[PDB]
From a paper:
Using X-ray crystallography, we show that the ciliopathy-associated centriolar protein CEP120 contains three C2 domains. CEP120, for example, plays a key role in the duplication, elongation, and maturation of centrioles, which in principle could impact the production of a functional basal body (Comartin et al., 2013, Lin et al., 2013, Mahjoub et al., 2010, Wu et al., 2014). All three C2 domains of CEP120 (C2A, C2B, and C2C) adopt the PLC δ1-like topology II and are structurally similar to each other (root-mean-square deviation [RMSD], 2.4–2.6 Å), with major differences found mainly in their loop length. Thus, the CEP120 C2 domains probably play a role as protein-protein interaction modules.
While the C2A domain of CEP120 interacts with tubulin and promotes microtubule formation (Lin et al., 2013, Sharma et al., 2018), our results suggest that the C2B domain does not directly contribute to this activity, as neither JS nor JATD mutations in C2B abolished the ability of CEP120 to cause centriole overextension when overexpressed in cells. Our structures revealed neither complexed Ca2+ nor potential Ca2+-coordinating top loop residues or cationic β-grooves.
Author numbering: -2 to 134
The structure:
């Protein structure tokens, strides 16, 4: 009819923020990673600003397969920013960003990979995040 409903499988996109490398050791600071996908922001809880920070957090969004297909075609990003948080002054500062896209994410799983932070505040070495991305069921 003139109005047509749509049905497709409900899915979870799960982004795993596993760990970092090549950060400066900063005992006064912590690190938070925030991810935004399609106007929905999720954040890790602060972890120590070690050289190899242990984020160990999954961030999950729900969508259906037809909406996912559209996001692939539009190359809708999952936008990550990494923040150094200074609890002594309740301040934070972006120390770099990563842009992920879903073009390849599938049930058929892919191994996590290292993504360097772009526009990094920490210009010695190459700070990076180990990130996994999967479609769950």
């Amino acid at each position: 009819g003139p109005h047509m409903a749509s049905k497709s499988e409900q899915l979870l996109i799960v982004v795993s923020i596993l760990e970092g490398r090549q950060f400066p050791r900063s005992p006064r600071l912590s690190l938070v990673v925030e991810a935004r996908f399609d106007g929905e922001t999720l954040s890790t809880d602060p972890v120590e600003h070690k050289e190899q920070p242990q984020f160990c957090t999954e961030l999950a969004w729900e969508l259906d397969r037809r909406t996912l297909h559209q996001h692939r075609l539009q190359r809708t990003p999952i936008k990550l920013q990494c923040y150094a948080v200074d609890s002594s002054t309740s301040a934070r500062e972006s120390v770099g960003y990563i842009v992920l896209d879903l073009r390849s994410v599938q049930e058929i799983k892919q191994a996590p990979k290292w993504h360097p932070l772009l526009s990094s505040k920490y210009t010695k070495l190459k700070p990076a995040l180990l990130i996994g991305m999967i479609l769950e069921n």
